[PDB]
């Protein structure tokens, strides 16, 4: 809504809010990102460190499908299964240890962040980390690798 904008309040003012000493010219400093090395160097060096220069190796034909590996933490692992499955745990006096498949929910890598409740689980994943496996073994479960 142009009604609520600033241009309506500037009617009658000569400079239109751009000063009368230094007028509003086309491009006093240049167009775009001009002058990153000269006359605009301080802004680039104090707000965008590492802008200039080249680092690392090139990868000509990079495909994101190969590097696709979603991760899930042990902090939220029972959320992938229904709540009644977790309710049917520490119960039945058998040690059921229901199987949790993370590839079904859309995860390949299992990370060890978070606290795992004291209940045996069967976790099947493409990859495992050392801490996650340690937590699962300490709780009383087992890690299963799936291709």
């Amino acid at each position: 809504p142009s009604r609520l904008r600033k241009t309506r309040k500037l009617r009658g003012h000569v400079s239109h809010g751009h000063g009368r000493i230094g007028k509003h010219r086309k491009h006093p400093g240049g167009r775009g990102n001009a002058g990153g090395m000269h006359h605009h160097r301080i802004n680039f060096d104090k707000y965008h460190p590492g802008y200039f220069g080249k680092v690392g190796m090139r990868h000509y034909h990079l495909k994101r499908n190969q590097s696709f590996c979603p991760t899930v933490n042990l902090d939220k692992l029972w959320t992938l299964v229904s709540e009644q499955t977790r309710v049917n745990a520490a119960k039945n006096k058998t040690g059921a240890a229901p199987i949790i498949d993370v590839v079904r929910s859309g995860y390949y890598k299992v990370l060890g962040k978070g606290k795992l409740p004291k209940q045996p689980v069967i976790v099947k994943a493409k990859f495992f980390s050392r801490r996650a496996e340690e937590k699962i073994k300490g709780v009383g479960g087992a890690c299963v690798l799936v291709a």
Binding site: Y47, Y51, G56, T79
Partner: protein, 187 residues
């Protein structure tokens, strides 16, 4: 002729909510009466937090509220939140709590009612505890938003850990001259 600076004479604090919704206005009127009449400062704090904006009342997680209520002494007290109570999925055991909040998520509401707790609104709080006796006032993390990671000492400054405004993070977008000791210098 008196020499007094007028640059800091008008205080900027809010006097009324900027929202136009009418239920918040009714709650504001009720707590205006309660704060201006009752000597309790709890009503004053509730009024001021009702005047606040969305970012000034961040949501309170279920786990944080449970942990705060876990402290000794504050047993059997009503939780008072001026923000929104949000469900926390990485916690399993939820005790029974009495909570007062403007908004409660459907998952959080279901989990609280399942455990046997009570959920109340501020108009019910006024009827139950007009002076706010036996209540614990809580709030969410004010610095929880991602904007504060960009605030503070500017990036590219020694002993600064501020996230710069980058279009996309990657190998060849940053971390070069200005950040590499091999490329010019680093801070």
């Amino acid at each position: 002729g008196v020499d007094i600076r007028h640059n800091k004479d008008r205080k900027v604090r809010r006097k009324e909510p900027k929202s136009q919704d009418i239920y918040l206005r009714l709650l504001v009127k009720l707590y205006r009466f309660l704060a201006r009449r009752t000597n309790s400062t709890f009503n004053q704090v509730v009024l001021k937090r009702l005047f606040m904006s969305r970012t000034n009342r961040p949501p309170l997680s279920l786990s944080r509220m449970i942990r705060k209520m876990k402290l000794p002494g504050r047993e059997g007290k009503t939780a008072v939140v001026v923000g929104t109570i949000t469900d926390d999925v990485r916690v399993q055991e939820v005790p029974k709590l009495k909570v007062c909040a403007l908004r409660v998520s459907s998952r959080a509401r279901s989990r609280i009612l399942k455990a046997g707790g009570k959920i109340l609104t501020f108009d019910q709080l006024a009827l139950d505890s007009p002076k706010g006796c036996g209540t614990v006032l809580l709030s969410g993390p004010r610095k929880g938003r991602e904007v504060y990671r960009h605030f503070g000492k500017a990036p590219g400054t020694p002993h600064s850990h501020t996230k710069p405004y980058v279009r996309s993070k990657g190998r060849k977008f940053e971390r070069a001259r200005g950040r590499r000791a091999s490329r010019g210098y680093k801070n």
